């Protein structure tokens, strides 16, 4: 991945143009590199959402609602 990206950013230094197969190889390698950094963050509760009464919360510990964030 790194080599193909460097080659793409460097070929123009020698007055040359890329070819379709090199482009396809670079795209495949870049996709393979990018599939490792994927995270897909999850959306937490709003923080004002009520907690169901079946969760058996405590009245004075402010467990009736989700913490939200921080």
């Amino acid at each position: 991945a790194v080599g193909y990206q460097l080659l793409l950013r460097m070929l123009s230094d020698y007055s040359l143009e890329p070819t379709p197969q090199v482009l396809s190889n670079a795209q495949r390698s870049y996709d393979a590199l990018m599939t490792d950094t994927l995270v897909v963050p999850s959306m937490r509760r709003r923080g004002d959402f009520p907690v169901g009464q079946g969760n058996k919360y405590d009245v004075f510990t402010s467990d009736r609602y989700y913490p939200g964030d921080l």
Binding site: F60, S62, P67, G68, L70
Partner: protein, 52 residues
């Protein structure tokens, strides 16, 4: 001689001797109504008050 020490038993009574104690003064004097139930670990770890 009579050796009848096996006719008795060693007994430890179910009584506790008194211990030592301290005094609680500072907690009763400092004000508590201002901070009471204003900070929650879920919401954060800091709260602020405005000066006059």
């Amino acid at each position: 001689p009579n050796n009848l020490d096996s006719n008795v038993s060693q007994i430890v009574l179910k009584k506790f001797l008194p211990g030592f104690m301290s005094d609680l003064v500072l907690a009763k004097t400092v004000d508590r109504q201002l901070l009471a139930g204003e900070i929650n670990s879920s919401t954060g770890d800091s709260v602020s008050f405005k000066r006059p």
